[PDB]
Amino acid sequence: ANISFCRNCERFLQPPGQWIRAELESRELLAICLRRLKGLTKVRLVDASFIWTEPHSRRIRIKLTVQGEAMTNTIIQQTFEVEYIVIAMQCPDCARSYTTNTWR
Amino acid sequence: AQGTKFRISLGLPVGAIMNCADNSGARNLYIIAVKGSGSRLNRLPAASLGDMVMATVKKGKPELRKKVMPAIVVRQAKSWRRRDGVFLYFEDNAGVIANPKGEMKGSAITGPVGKECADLWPRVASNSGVVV
Amino acid sequence: MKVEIDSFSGAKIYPGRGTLFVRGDSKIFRFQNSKSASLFKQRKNPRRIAWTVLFRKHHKK
Amino acid sequence: SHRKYEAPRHGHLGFLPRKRAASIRARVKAFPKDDRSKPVALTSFLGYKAGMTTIVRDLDRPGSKFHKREVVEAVTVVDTPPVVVVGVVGYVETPRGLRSLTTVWAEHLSDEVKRRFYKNWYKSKKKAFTKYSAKYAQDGAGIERELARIKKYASVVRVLVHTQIRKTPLAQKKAHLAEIQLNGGSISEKVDWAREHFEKTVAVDSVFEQNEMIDAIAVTKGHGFEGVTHRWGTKKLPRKTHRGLRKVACIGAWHPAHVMWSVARAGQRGYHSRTSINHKIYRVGKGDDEANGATSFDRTKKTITPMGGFVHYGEIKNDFIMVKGCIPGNRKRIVTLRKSLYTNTSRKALEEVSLKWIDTASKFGKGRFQTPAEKHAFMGTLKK
RNA sequence: GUGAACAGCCUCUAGUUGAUAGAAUAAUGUAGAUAAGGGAAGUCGGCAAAAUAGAUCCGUAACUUCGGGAUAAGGAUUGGC
RNA sequence: GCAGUCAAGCGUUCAUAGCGACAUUGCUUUUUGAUUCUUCGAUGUCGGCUCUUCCUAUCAUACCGAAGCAGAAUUCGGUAAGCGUUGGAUUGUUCACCCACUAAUAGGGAACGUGAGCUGGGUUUAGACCGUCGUGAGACAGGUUAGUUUUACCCUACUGAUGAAUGUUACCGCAAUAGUAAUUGAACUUAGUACGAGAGGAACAGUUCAUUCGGAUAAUUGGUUUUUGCGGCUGUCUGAUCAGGCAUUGCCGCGAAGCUACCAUCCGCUGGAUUAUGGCUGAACGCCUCUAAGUCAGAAUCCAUGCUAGAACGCGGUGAUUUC
């Protein structure tokens, strides 16, 4: 999946319009699983953590366990890891400052 | 996953509520797409006798509802041409539900099943009591 | 090549002619043309239609 | 702005302009490649399409699902009278193309070909080919110089033939004239073939054989001035449109400020010249036979003319060709049949067929009997 | 006359037969239509059309200012002699 | 937005297989600003529906190169715009966002394409309620409701249709030039084979069908009915019976002929020259090298074969040519 952020703000984008900031712990993990495209269908959750790999490479790896249901009475937990390519663009709020119409 | 089938006329567009042939608890199936259909501007994809579709339950057991699962058309009311010559058509549409591999959840099928559906799917021909 | 008889009245059906109808209780009905195929849907009784062979067999024509 | 939804184009651009053809007889643009090791024969033929009927054959195609199974299939019957040769014509080659050199006509010509040369036959003194026929009337030195002109020069040789219209239930009395190229060998031998066939008939079965892939060339059925929806298959506008909905909305952008040549627009529909390829011959029937409609699996004596004849055409009491699938051009139309330009192999050309049954019920609507000999056995004794 | 009826449809007494006409039956319009299978997937939106309908008998819920809702919903029947 | 160069941190030990921040040199007009040059004796100012064509900075498809490429699955780069790029819930939406199919759901331009082509939901007249502000009229680009979309017959353009003049007139042909079209996917087989420690797991040739598109066509099946063709029925009118009028085609069943539909069937060709890359011989440089001189193989590309039109100022071959 894809995450958009600003190179002048350093602030992550929630897909509708919002701009929840980045802590990479306990609040950035919350926005990042709504984009996970998994559905609430069969996980409900199990556990989630991320991998360190690199600061300047634009890829964030998360691994997660699901605890879903397969047969009529079989609860079952499996795990896997997802790699998010992180795409850089502008904050329109903070690209406005280059236009001298800053105050409003 | 689908074998070769001679082309027959398309009679079930998206949104058609067809009957449910088996005894797996459902009563009707709501076709939302067709596996292996094409692409054209403003053209609705359509199903035929023997196609694999995605279909939801609108009426039946409360376990089966509110999720999408694949299904197989077994009867059809729009007339199609067989190669031997006769134009035939059933009385109402019908569909049985299956896994994406093609195995059938049902135990038995009531009513008749189209012959070109029976040759295309092996597990349908096991559950079929009457083949045309 | 088999020539089937009309289910409604009496007519011979050569290959590639007329329609076929499978009723929901798995019974096969053959029709020679749209005349007897439309009179079948009106729940008309072919023993009382005069031009059928099923009538002329009954009243000894 | 861009297009916001990609969609493929309406219509085909290689078939422009849709204008009326110059004549009802469509020209053969290209004849097949000559092979001079083989003997002399014709390469195309002329005929008149009559109608369609249904056929049943046992399909023999391995690896299919309908193997050794009866299939019903649609065929056309083109009425094909024997065609008689009246002249030959030889072409020399230039850097600017092929140029006609000399046409040599035969001595006697029928009344059917003379109709073609006149627009008002009954007022005419019928003077066509009177001074030409005096050349044969003497010792004939005026013509032996002309064929020897073609033997020396003249790379390719065509042969002027014409149909026999009196052996055909049309009301027209005028014959149709056409060129046909020969593909024999050693063009001093091609002209000696046509020399011996002046005022001689050419049958149909010598040219074509059964199970052979041929083409069909004719002029399409016409329809007159038709609108942009049924001409190109474009989309109808919604219901709420002021002043028309069976149109095309945007002719084009601002720039270029000209209507482009590619947009869809109403005009003539039909009566075009079309070449259709790869039609397979099923049956080459002779005229002097009561068993045109018979089959080895049927064994009933009947002709292929249905009960009450073909609609708008009449009686096929001649030679005919029965070929698979539709042919461009309607009934009564002059239709050229050409050999295939390339050798075909794949699976479908080499297949041999034997019929099960020919449909001879009445085409004039909802016919239920095949021959009137067995209509009387079903209904029995009537009043009349 | 039909019918609950001065509704609609047809005739009697009385009036008019005027509204530029002839010939062909392309496109696109205007007005009136019918359509296989699916049935709002169309669209800003069921816009437009379609279905329902007259009578007699059965049966009629929530809610309520107790009057209503109510032709609620829903289901049969209708000629001729 | 986008592309170079330089290559910090990384890729368990390895600067460049592959991610790549920061510095530095540029391009583009698909953003946002700056400006005031054109138009205020009016260029109809958002989005959608419809339709053509162009661009390549390539998502798919064809043929290749590189890898930390065993297979399978991928990832990076080259030639290349021939061809394809969808169906839906919510919103006036552009934008977004999920659901499902698919080979793939790539980005863009043409007066931010297209209103004498449409629709009028939005915006931006007058009516009206609310909330904050105002003493008050009133303000709000805050929220919500109701609100007329005019003309083409002219000229060019395009699509079709005739036509004077070349001695008259008829027939049969040649081809300058312009257009050009087919596209993709599954299944079996090759084979549980190559490969693999296994788990897993291919491809070329062959066969059969299908998607999208195109040309036709009416045997068959379905649709349409003013054949008012035959039959049925209601109300009235010709005294009844027959046979008919009227009900702006009275309605209902059936209904040939015509037109017609992936709602029906049929058909859609093979040769040459090249790009990307792989090779041969072989110097420059006694070696080595696909390149310098020469040369072989090679893509959905280019040109032909084929297909459509036939220059109304392109042309050829033949028939007859007005005593009377």
Coordinates of N, CA and C in Angstrom, one line a residue, chain B:
Chain B
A1 N -9.5 -21.2 -14.1 CA -10.1 -22.3 -13.4 C -11.3 -22.9 -14.2
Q2 N -11.7 -22.1 -15.2 CA -12.8 -22.6 -16.0 C -12.4 -23.2 -17.4
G3 N -13.0 -24.3 -17.7 CA -12.6 -25.0 -18.9 C -13.3 -24.4 -20.1
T4 N -13.1 -25.0 -21.3 CA -13.7 -24.4 -22.5 C -15.2 -24.7 -22.6
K5 N -15.9 -23.7 -23.0 CA -17.4 -23.8 -23.2 C -17.7 -23.0 -24.4
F6 N -18.6 -23.7 -25.2 CA -19.2 -23.0 -26.4 C -20.0 -21.8 -26.0
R7 N -20.0 -20.8 -26.8 CA -20.7 -19.5 -26.4 C -22.2 -19.7 -26.5
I8 N -22.9 -19.4 -25.4 CA -24.3 -19.3 -25.4 C -24.7 -17.9 -25.0
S9 N -26.0 -17.6 -25.2 CA -26.5 -16.2 -25.1 C -26.4 -15.7 -23.6
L10 N -26.1 -14.5 -23.4 CA -26.0 -13.9 -22.1 C -27.3 -13.4 -21.6
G11 N -27.7 -14.0 -20.5 CA -29.1 -13.7 -20.0 C -29.2 -13.2 -18.6
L12 N -28.1 -13.0 -17.8 CA -28.2 -12.6 -16.4 C -27.2 -11.4 -16.2
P13 N -27.6 -10.2 -16.4 CA -26.7 -9.1 -16.1 C -26.5 -8.9 -14.6
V14 N -25.7 -7.9 -14.2 CA -25.4 -7.6 -12.8 C -26.6 -7.0 -12.1
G15 N -27.0 -7.6 -11.0 CA -28.2 -7.2 -10.3 C -29.3 -8.2 -10.3
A16 N -29.2 -9.2 -11.1 CA -30.2 -10.2 -11.3 C -30.3 -11.0 -10.0
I17 N -31.6 -11.1 -9.5 CA -31.8 -12.0 -8.3 C -32.4 -13.3 -8.9
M18 N -31.5 -14.3 -8.8 CA -31.9 -15.6 -9.3 C -32.2 -16.5 -8.1
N19 N -32.9 -17.6 -8.3 CA -33.2 -18.6 -7.3 C -32.0 -19.3 -6.8
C20 N -32.1 -20.1 -5.7 CA -31.0 -20.9 -5.2 C -31.4 -22.3 -5.3
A21 N -30.7 -23.1 -6.0 CA -31.1 -24.5 -6.3 C -30.9 -25.5 -5.2
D22 N -29.8 -25.3 -4.4 CA -29.5 -26.4 -3.5 C -30.2 -26.2 -2.2
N23 N -29.8 -27.0 -1.2 CA -30.4 -27.0 0.2 C -29.3 -26.6 1.2
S24 N -28.5 -25.5 0.8 CA -27.5 -25.0 1.7 C -28.0 -23.9 2.6
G25 N -29.3 -23.7 2.6 CA -29.9 -22.7 3.4 C -30.3 -21.4 2.8
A26 N -29.7 -21.0 1.7 CA -30.0 -19.8 1.0 C -31.3 -19.9 0.2
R27 N -31.9 -18.8 -0.2 CA -33.1 -18.8 -1.0 C -33.0 -18.1 -2.3
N28 N -32.1 -17.0 -2.3 CA -31.9 -16.4 -3.6 C -30.5 -15.8 -3.6
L29 N -29.9 -15.6 -4.8 CA -28.5 -15.1 -5.0 C -28.6 -13.9 -5.8
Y30 N -27.7 -12.9 -5.5 CA -27.7 -11.6 -6.1 C -26.4 -11.5 -6.9
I31 N -26.4 -11.6 -8.2 CA -25.2 -11.6 -9.0 C -24.6 -10.2 -9.0
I32 N -23.3 -10.1 -8.6 CA -22.6 -8.8 -8.6 C -21.5 -8.8 -9.6
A33 N -20.9 -9.9 -10.1 CA -20.0 -9.9 -11.2 C -19.9 -11.3 -11.7
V34 N -19.2 -11.4 -12.9 CA -19.0 -12.7 -13.6 C -17.5 -12.9 -13.8
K35 N -17.0 -14.1 -13.4 CA -15.6 -14.4 -13.6 C -15.3 -14.6 -15.1
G36 N -14.3 -13.9 -15.5 CA -13.9 -14.0 -16.9 C -14.6 -13.2 -17.9
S37 N -15.3 -12.1 -17.4 CA -16.0 -11.2 -18.4 C -15.1 -10.2 -18.9
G38 N -15.6 -9.4 -19.8 CA -14.7 -8.4 -20.5 C -14.8 -7.0 -20.0
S39 N -14.6 -6.1 -20.9 CA -14.5 -4.6 -20.5 C -14.9 -3.8 -21.7
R40 N -15.9 -2.9 -21.5 CA -16.4 -1.9 -22.5 C -17.0 -0.8 -21.7
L41 N -17.0 0.4 -22.3 CA -17.6 1.6 -21.6 C -19.1 1.4 -21.6
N42 N -19.6 1.5 -20.4 CA -21.0 1.4 -20.0 C -21.7 0.1 -20.4
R43 N -20.9 -0.9 -20.5 CA -21.4 -2.3 -20.7 C -21.5 -3.0 -19.4
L44 N -22.6 -3.6 -19.1 CA -22.8 -4.4 -17.9 C -22.3 -5.8 -18.2
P45 N -21.5 -6.4 -17.3 CA -21.1 -7.8 -17.5 C -22.2 -8.7 -17.2
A46 N -22.3 -9.8 -17.9 CA -23.5 -10.7 -17.9 C -23.0 -12.1 -17.7
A47 N -23.9 -12.9 -17.2 CA -23.7 -14.3 -16.9 C -24.4 -15.2 -17.9
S48 N -24.1 -16.4 -18.0 CA -24.7 -17.4 -18.9 C -24.8 -18.7 -18.1
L49 N -25.4 -19.7 -18.8 CA -25.5 -21.0 -18.2 C -24.1 -21.7 -18.1
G50 N -23.7 -21.9 -16.9 CA -22.4 -22.6 -16.6 C -21.3 -21.6 -16.2
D51 N -21.6 -20.4 -16.0 CA -20.5 -19.4 -15.6 C -20.4 -19.4 -14.1
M52 N -19.2 -19.0 -13.7 CA -18.9 -18.8 -12.3 C -19.1 -17.3 -12.0
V53 N -19.9 -17.0 -11.0 CA -20.3 -15.6 -10.7 C -19.9 -15.4 -9.2
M54 N -19.8 -14.1 -8.8 CA -19.8 -13.7 -7.4 C -21.2 -13.3 -7.0
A55 N -21.7 -13.9 -5.9 CA -23.1 -13.7 -5.6 C -23.3 -13.7 -4.1
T56 N -24.2 -12.8 -3.6 CA -24.5 -12.7 -2.2 C -25.9 -13.2 -1.9
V57 N -26.2 -13.6 -0.6 CA -27.5 -14.1 -0.2 C -28.3 -12.9 0.3
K58 N -29.5 -12.7 -0.2 CA -30.4 -11.7 0.2 C -31.5 -12.2 1.1
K59 N -31.6 -13.5 1.2 CA -32.7 -14.1 1.9 C -32.4 -15.6 2.2
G60 N -32.4 -16.0 3.5 CA -32.1 -17.3 3.8 C -31.6 -17.4 5.3
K61 N -30.6 -18.2 5.5 CA -30.0 -18.3 6.8 C -29.3 -17.1 7.2
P62 N -29.3 -16.7 8.5 CA -28.5 -15.5 8.9 C -27.0 -15.7 8.9
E63 N -26.5 -16.9 8.9 CA -25.1 -17.2 8.8 C -24.5 -16.8 7.4
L64 N -25.3 -17.0 6.4 CA -24.8 -16.9 5.0 C -24.8 -15.5 4.6
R65 N -25.6 -14.6 5.2 CA -25.8 -13.3 4.6 C -24.6 -12.4 4.9
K66 N -24.6 -11.2 4.2 CA -23.7 -10.1 4.3 C -22.3 -10.4 4.1
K67 N -22.0 -11.3 3.1 CA -20.7 -11.6 2.6 C -20.7 -12.1 1.2
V68 N -19.6 -12.0 0.5 CA -19.6 -12.3 -0.9 C -18.9 -13.7 -1.1
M69 N -19.5 -14.5 -2.0 CA -19.0 -15.9 -2.2 C -19.3 -16.3 -3.6
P70 N -18.5 -17.2 -4.2 CA -18.7 -17.5 -5.6 C -19.9 -18.6 -5.8
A71 N -20.4 -18.6 -7.0 CA -21.6 -19.4 -7.3 C -21.6 -19.7 -8.8
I72 N -22.5 -20.7 -9.1 CA -22.5 -21.3 -10.4 C -23.9 -21.3 -10.9
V73 N -24.2 -20.8 -12.1 CA -25.5 -20.8 -12.7 C -25.8 -22.2 -13.2
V74 N -27.0 -22.7 -12.9 CA -27.5 -24.0 -13.4 C -28.7 -24.0 -14.2
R75 N -29.5 -22.9 -14.1 CA -30.7 -22.8 -15.0 C -30.8 -21.4 -15.6
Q76 N -31.6 -21.2 -16.6 CA -31.6 -20.0 -17.4 C -32.9 -19.9 -18.2
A77 N -33.5 -18.7 -18.2 CA -34.8 -18.5 -18.9 C -34.6 -17.9 -20.3
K78 N -33.5 -17.3 -20.5 CA -33.2 -16.8 -21.9 C -32.8 -18.0 -22.8
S79 N -33.4 -18.1 -24.0 CA -33.1 -19.2 -24.8 C -31.8 -19.2 -25.5
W80 N -31.1 -20.3 -25.5 CA -29.8 -20.4 -26.2 C -29.9 -21.5 -27.3
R81 N -28.9 -21.4 -28.2 CA -28.8 -22.4 -29.3 C -27.9 -23.5 -28.9
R82 N -28.3 -24.7 -29.0 CA -27.4 -25.8 -29.0 C -27.0 -26.2 -30.4
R83 N -25.9 -26.9 -30.5 CA -25.3 -27.2 -31.8 C -26.0 -28.2 -32.5
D84 N -26.8 -29.1 -31.8 CA -27.6 -30.1 -32.6 C -28.8 -29.5 -33.2
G85 N -29.2 -28.3 -32.7 CA -30.2 -27.5 -33.5 C -31.3 -26.9 -32.7
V86 N -31.7 -27.5 -31.5 CA -32.9 -27.0 -30.8 C -32.5 -25.8 -30.0
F87 N -33.5 -24.8 -30.0 CA -33.4 -23.7 -29.0 C -34.2 -24.1 -27.8
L88 N -33.6 -24.1 -26.6 CA -34.3 -24.5 -25.4 C -34.1 -23.4 -24.4
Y89 N -34.9 -23.4 -23.3 CA -34.9 -22.5 -22.2 C -35.6 -23.1 -21.1
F90 N -35.2 -22.8 -19.9 CA -35.8 -23.3 -18.7 C -36.9 -22.4 -18.2
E91 N -37.5 -22.6 -17.0 CA -38.6 -21.8 -16.6 C -38.1 -20.6 -15.7
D92 N -37.1 -20.8 -14.9 CA -36.5 -19.8 -14.1 C -35.0 -19.9 -13.9
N93 N -34.4 -18.9 -13.4 CA -32.9 -18.9 -13.2 C -32.6 -19.6 -11.9
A94 N -31.4 -20.1 -11.8 CA -31.1 -20.8 -10.5 C -29.5 -20.8 -10.4
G95 N -29.1 -20.9 -9.2 CA -27.6 -20.9 -8.9 C -27.3 -21.7 -7.6
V96 N -26.2 -22.4 -7.7 CA -25.7 -23.2 -6.5 C -24.4 -22.5 -6.1
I97 N -24.1 -22.6 -4.8 CA -22.9 -21.9 -4.3 C -21.8 -22.8 -4.1
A98 N -20.6 -22.3 -4.3 CA -19.4 -23.1 -4.3 C -18.2 -22.3 -3.8
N99 N -17.1 -23.0 -3.6 CA -15.8 -22.4 -3.2 C -15.1 -21.9 -4.5
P100 N -14.1 -21.1 -4.4 CA -13.4 -20.7 -5.7 C -12.6 -21.8 -6.4
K101 N -12.4 -22.9 -5.8 CA -11.9 -24.1 -6.5 C -12.9 -24.7 -7.4
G102 N -14.2 -24.7 -7.0 CA -15.3 -25.2 -7.8 C -16.0 -26.3 -7.1
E103 N -15.6 -26.7 -5.9 CA -16.4 -27.8 -5.2 C -17.6 -27.2 -4.5
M104 N -18.7 -27.9 -4.5 CA -20.0 -27.5 -4.1 C -20.3 -27.7 -2.6
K105 N -20.8 -26.7 -1.9 CA -21.1 -26.8 -0.5 C -22.4 -27.6 -0.3
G106 N -23.3 -27.7 -1.4 CA -24.6 -28.2 -1.2 C -24.5 -29.8 -1.2
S107 N -25.7 -30.4 -0.8 CA -25.7 -31.8 -0.7 C -26.5 -32.4 -2.0
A108 N -27.5 -31.7 -2.4 CA -28.3 -32.1 -3.6 C -29.0 -30.9 -4.2
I109 N -29.3 -31.1 -5.5 CA -29.9 -30.0 -6.2 C -31.3 -30.4 -6.6
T110 N -32.3 -29.5 -6.3 CA -33.6 -29.8 -6.8 C -33.8 -29.2 -8.2
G111 N -34.7 -29.9 -8.9 CA -35.0 -29.5 -10.3 C -33.9 -29.9 -11.2
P112 N -34.1 -29.5 -12.5 CA -33.1 -29.9 -13.5 C -31.9 -29.0 -13.6
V113 N -30.8 -29.5 -14.2 CA -29.6 -28.7 -14.4 C -29.3 -28.7 -15.9
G114 N -28.8 -27.6 -16.4 CA -28.4 -27.5 -17.8 C -27.2 -28.4 -18.1
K115 N -27.3 -29.0 -19.3 CA -26.3 -30.0 -19.7 C -24.9 -29.4 -19.9
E116 N -24.9 -28.2 -20.4 CA -23.6 -27.6 -20.6 C -22.9 -27.1 -19.3
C117 N -23.8 -27.0 -18.3 CA -23.2 -26.8 -16.9 C -22.7 -28.0 -16.3
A118 N -23.3 -29.2 -16.7 CA -22.8 -30.4 -16.0 C -21.5 -30.9 -16.6
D119 N -21.3 -30.7 -17.9 CA -20.0 -31.1 -18.5 C -18.8 -30.2 -18.1
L120 N -19.2 -29.0 -17.7 CA -18.1 -28.0 -17.5 C -17.6 -28.2 -16.1
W121 N -18.4 -28.6 -15.1 CA -18.0 -28.7 -13.7 C -18.3 -30.1 -13.3
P122 N -17.3 -30.8 -12.7 CA -17.5 -32.2 -12.3 C -18.3 -32.3 -11.0
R123 N -18.2 -31.5 -10.1 CA -18.9 -31.6 -8.8 C -20.3 -31.3 -8.9
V124 N -20.7 -30.5 -9.9 CA -22.1 -30.2 -10.2 C -22.8 -31.4 -10.7
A125 N -22.1 -32.2 -11.5 CA -22.7 -33.4 -12.1 C -22.8 -34.5 -11.1
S126 N -22.1 -34.5 -10.0 CA -22.3 -35.4 -8.9 C -23.5 -35.2 -8.2
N127 N -23.8 -33.9 -7.8 CA -25.0 -33.6 -7.0 C -26.2 -33.5 -7.9
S128 N -26.1 -33.6 -9.2 CA -27.3 -33.4 -10.1 C -28.1 -34.7 -10.1
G129 N -29.4 -34.5 -9.8 CA -30.3 -35.6 -10.0 C -30.8 -35.7 -11.4
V130 N -31.3 -34.6 -11.9 CA -31.8 -34.6 -13.3 C -30.9 -33.7 -14.2
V131 N -30.4 -34.3 -15.2 CA -29.6 -33.5 -16.2 C -30.5 -33.4 -17.5
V132 N -31.1 -32.2 -17.6 CA -32.0 -31.9 -18.7 C -33.1 -32.9 -18.9

